């Protein structure tokens, strides 16, 4: 084979349609389904799979008690076929660690996993199932990565890392990898102030990433990466549509070389597709909780500080619990453009449901269409009382 | 394909990083996971798998009562993907027997398994999934083998066997196999006095094996095998760092043409990487029990009887139960050197935990790195009370 190149444009997005859904909790009630968090979707040239970090226990086991904590020596990155639940008998382990990211470059898959204590943390870069290279910490404060998939161009796969306070300035770096090896890295630049958990996609040029600001505001940072030059810049989305959670109420005028204030030290992973007029943003419905989920068509959101939605679609009702979301694409599909897709984590259990001592998620994902299609709701459908 | 040749050197080892972990017991609490012992790791040209001897029962079944005994007609060698638990639905059986070893020569896999009564025991050599050759006993006292993987060079795979008292002199032999057939064998020679359960790795020349002395001392034997000449020698490690378990307290000066005394008729499987300055030894923390595990960098340990550690890493805390350990390598990986790796068995249940009537293990493994990475702990994380 050869390396995948970013040559096609994005398809026009008129509506979204369902791509996949595992119903992991509904199944888990009576079967050997693993407890997971932080799911994402990624495709190889001929296959799409779900990825997630498991807790080293099944939903109904007794070791499911306390799964609310996310950094432990029992966590690992697993992969399983789309729309199947993450069962113990069909999952493959990709790596070990409490935080990770992965992607395919057209020849093979790269996977980066972070493990260790909060200070003396480390990351191991795997390629084609072999460990290749390692990274130690620099700030010594819970090294973090993207969670969602990475995008490669001609063999080069930029990856975003953070080490430092999650409630203050932090040192972030972009590493450029090829076949698992480090070509170079850069200190992050531009006007964004705090970067975490970036969701990225490529088009015909560079790679665009939507990230979380977990310090000052509800205004998401955007990173623009040029994989050939291996250079980048950053800014916030200039739009009076806030997308983080929690968030203050939407202003009439947005700003973008400064985070929009009002909700400190918090936020969630999310995504956007920025394409001039063909621009869509995702967010929760609730401004105070991880509940509901919607897509809004907001033309020129990246640069127009008075832009407002002109079209949209409800994915998850605000009556239903939501979770982290992010973007993905099939870069090997036939056609002259890429079909944009995204996924949403549906979180059940603690801390919102205190009747159980575990936490878990189900996953739903959707892809764009050029047709105007109808809409429906996508809850996980699990009855918490069945687990009591 | 062709045969694998031992042509590359060892990589510099500055630190160890996690390679894999199954969490078999934590999962087993609520699922159909098999009871095993004596795990090891071995790789084919494109895949790494865990190997272990199963007891013919699941952890939560009623036949798990009494699994403490290790020689029975219900034992078999199984293989399953790295970091997955040894479940009943994803394991492949390689052979039947209570003691075994295996390895890949670049074209196919060889597997040797021992079965039978304590006196009229026998071994069957399999190759490419067919039985090829058989070996009967010579001393008639529980024929034993290496447990961990074997190393092949240009098709020849030396294997170490023992038949005789485990508490006195015994007859040991080295067999040289090719494509499952016996080319020759040799009575063991050199100055080592008692050899069991050898852990071997190759470099650019020969094959180096670290073995257990289960009779006179805490000073591990080393066997040096030349696979081309099909000849060998032996000695003990000349280092005042004892590595067996139980062991007396470390002396100031070691010795090596005689076992270091003080703890008779006991000991465990373990390993070392001997490479002049780039020398690392593994051992338990406890001197009296199979608890904890650490790696020590002890330059020139093979020959310097006053050498002491200059660097090290804790793998398992002494608060946690440990078990057998050993070495392995991926001999098909890209690069100019071999990345050294090792594994540790974590034993749970009887005889240390008398609240349950079974025994089982979880497995963790690590590989070297040239970077200086931090360290963490790797317990299995199972709550014994959940099984009561």
């Amino acid at each position, epitope marked *: 084979r050869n390396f995948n190149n970013l040559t096609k444009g994005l398809c026009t997005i008129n509506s979204w349609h369902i791509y996949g859904k595992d119903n992991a909790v509904r199944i888990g009630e009576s079967s050997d389904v693993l407890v997971t968090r932080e799911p994402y979707v990624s495709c190889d040239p001929d296959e799409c799979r779900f990825y997630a970090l498991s807790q080293g226990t099944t939903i109904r086991g007794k070791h499911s008690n306390g799964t609310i904590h996310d950094r432990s020596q029992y966590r690992a990155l697993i992969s399983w076929p789309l729309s199947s639940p993450p069962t113990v008998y069909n999952s493959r382990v990709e790596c070990i660690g409490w935080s990770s990211t992965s992607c395919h470059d057209g020849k093979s898959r790269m996977s980066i996993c972070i493990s260790g*204590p909060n200070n003396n943390a480390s990351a191991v870069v795997w390629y084609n199932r072999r460990p290749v290279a390692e990274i130690n910490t620099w700030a010594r404060n819970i090294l973090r990565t993207q969670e969602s998939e990475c995008v490669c161009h001609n063999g080069v796969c930029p990856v975003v890392f953070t080490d430092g306070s999650a*409630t203050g300035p932090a040192d972030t770096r972009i590493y450029y990898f090829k076949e698992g090896k480090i070509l170079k890295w850069e200190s992050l630049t531009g006007t964004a102030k705090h970067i975490e958990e970036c969701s990225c996609y490529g088009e015909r040029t560079g790679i665009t990433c939507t990230c979380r600001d977990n310090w000052q505001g509800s205004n998401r940072p955007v990173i623009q990466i040029d994989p050939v030059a291996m250079t980048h810049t950053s800014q916030y989305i200039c739009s009076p549509v806030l997308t983080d959670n929690p968030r203050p109420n939407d202003p009439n005028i947005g700003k973008c070389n400064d985070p929009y204030p009002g909700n400190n030290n918090n936020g969630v992973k999310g995504f956007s597709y920025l394409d001039g007029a063909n621009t869509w943003l995702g967010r929760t419905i609730s401004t105070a909780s991880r509940s509901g989920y919607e897509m809004l068509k907001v033309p020129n959101a990246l640069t127009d500080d008075r832009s407002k939605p002109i079209q949209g679609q409800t994915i998850v009702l605000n009556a239903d619990w939501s979770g982290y979301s992010g973007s993905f694409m099939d870069y090997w599909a036939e056609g002259d453009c890429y079909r944009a897709c995204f996924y949403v984590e549906l979180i059940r259990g603690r801390p919102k449901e205190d009747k159980v001592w575990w936490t878990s998620n189900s996953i739903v994902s959707m892809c764009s269409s050029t047709e105007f299609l109808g809409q429906w709701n996508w809850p996980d459908g699990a009855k918490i009382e069945y687990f009591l | 394909r062709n045969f694998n040749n031992l042509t590359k050197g060892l990589c510099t080892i500055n630190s160890w990083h996690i390679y894999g972990k199954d969490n078999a017991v934590r999962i087993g609490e609520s699922s159909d996971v098999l009871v095993t012992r004596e795990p090891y790791v071995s790789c084919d040209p494109d895949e790494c798998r865990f190997y272990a001897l199963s007891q013919g029962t699941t952890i939560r079944g009623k036949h798990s009562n009494g699994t403490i005994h290790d020689r029975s007609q219900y034992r078999a060698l199984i293989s399953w993907p790295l970091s997955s638990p040894p479940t009943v639905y994803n394991s492949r059986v390689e052979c039947i027997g209570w003691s075994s070893t295996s390895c890949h020569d670049g074209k196919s896999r060889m597997s040797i398994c021992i079965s039978g009564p304590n006196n009229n025991a026998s071994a069957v050599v399999w190759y490419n999934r067919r039985p090829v050759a058989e070996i009967n006993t010579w001393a008639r006292n529980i024929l034993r083998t290496q447990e961990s993987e074997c190393v092949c060079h240009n098709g020849v795979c030396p294997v170490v066997f023992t038949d005789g008292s485990a508490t006195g002199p015994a007859d040991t032999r080295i067999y040289y196999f090719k494509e499952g057939k016996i080319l020759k064998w040799e009575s063991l020679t050199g100055t080592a006095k008692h050899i069991e359960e050898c852990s071997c790795y190759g470099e650019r020349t020969g094959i180096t094996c670290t073995c257990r002395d289960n009779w006179q001392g805490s000073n591990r034997p080393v066997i040096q095998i030349d696979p081309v000449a099909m000849t060998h020698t032996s000695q003990y490690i000349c280092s005042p760092v004892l590595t067996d378990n139980p062991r007396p307290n470390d002396p100031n000066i070691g010795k090596c043409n005689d076992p270091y005394p003080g703890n008779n008729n006991n000991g465990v499987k373990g390993f070392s990487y001997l490479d002049g300055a780039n020398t690392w030894l593994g051992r338990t923390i406890s001197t009296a029990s199979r608890s904890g595990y650490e790696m020590l960098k002890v330059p020139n340990a093979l020959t310097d009887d006053r050498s002491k550690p200059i660097q090290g890493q804790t793998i398992v805390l002494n608060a946690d139960w440990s078990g057998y350990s050993g070495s392995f390598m991926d001999y098909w990986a890209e690069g100019d050197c071999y990345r050294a790796c090792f594994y540790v068995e974590l034993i749970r249940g009887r005889p240390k935990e008398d609240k349950v009537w079974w025994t089982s293990n979880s497995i963790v493994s690590m590989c070297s790195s040239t970077e200086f990475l931090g360290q963490w*702990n790797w317990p299995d994380g199972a709550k014994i009370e959940y099984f009561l």
Partner: antibody, heavy 129, light 109 residues
Framework: QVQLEESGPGLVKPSETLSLTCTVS?????????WGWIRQPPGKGLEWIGC???????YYNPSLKSRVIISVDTTKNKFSLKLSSVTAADTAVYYC??????????????????????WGQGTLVTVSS | VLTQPPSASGTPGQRVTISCSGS????????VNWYQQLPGTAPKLLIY???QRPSGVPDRFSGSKSGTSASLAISGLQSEDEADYYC???????????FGGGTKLTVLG
């Protein structure tokens, strides 16, 4: 010897933001030790709130973060604590303290996590109508 | 949260101990500190790094840790040692200073 002293209102109404300031004297805080705050309800034990340094590398108690801000003014050798939406449960003695952890004291022979060696005398804050 | 008994006691001159315990994310991995609070003031650090003490702390105060539990031993109990004693440790799940509440040590007489 560095001295620490808390000051601010002893009374805040419910829902209001509480603001306390700790003045540091005898030491320039731009030098890097972490400074932070501890709470002690009148009949209870101690609770850590958070700490920060001159570079803003803050740490906060997860139960309070997003409600609480700790900042450092190197120019005036002062640091301060702010908590939005105070409630009855926030009545407590507040203390400011110095923390030499994270090798911020400029030593690598120290425990990474050390403890809090310098304490101010503290102040009592009541939340009431 | 760390666990401590609510009280401890002994007569002058006796050796008494205060225990502290729970989890693998905190004292089970990191070091443990002990602080002493008198009724009218801020707590003083007595023990850090499991068994070290700051200059000025009497050697009658001796810390020890094993497994997932720890203790403070007070030799030569004095009337002046009546106090609220606290156990504390960094806990990686929260990533910041967990306390065990306190133990009231009463000197009898």
């Amino acid at each position: 010897q560095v001295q620490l002293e808390e000051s601010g209102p002893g009374l805040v109404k419910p829902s209001e933001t509480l603001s306390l300031t700790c003045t540091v004297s005898g030491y320039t805080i731009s030098s890097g030790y972490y400074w932070g705050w501890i709470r002690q309800p009148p009949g209870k034990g101690l609770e850590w709130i958070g700490c920060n340094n001159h570079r803003g590398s803050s740490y906060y108690n997860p139960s309070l973060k997003s409600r609480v801000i700790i900042s450092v003014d190197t120019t005036k050798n002062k640091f301060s604590l702010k908590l939005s939406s105070v409630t009855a449960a926030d009545t407590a003695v507040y203390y400011c303290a110095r923390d030499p952890s994270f090798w911020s004291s400029t030593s690598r022979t120290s425990p990474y996590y050390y403890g809090m060696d310098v304490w101010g005398q503290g102040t009592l804050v009541t939340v009431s109508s | 949260v760390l666990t401590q008994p609510p009280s401890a006691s002994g007569t002058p001159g006796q050796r008494v101990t205060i225990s502290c315990s729970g989890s693998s994310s905190n004292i089970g991995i990191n070091t443990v500190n002990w602080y002493q609070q008198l009724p009218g003031t801020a707590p003083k650090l007595l023990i850090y790094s499991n068994n070290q003490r700051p200059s000025g702390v009497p050697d009658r105060f001796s810390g020890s840790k094993s497994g997932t539990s720890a203790s403070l031993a007070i030799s030569g109990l004095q009337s002046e040692d009546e106090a609220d004693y606290y156990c504390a440790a960094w806990d990686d799940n929260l990533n910041g200073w967990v306390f065990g509440g306190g133990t009231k040590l009463t000197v009898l007489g």
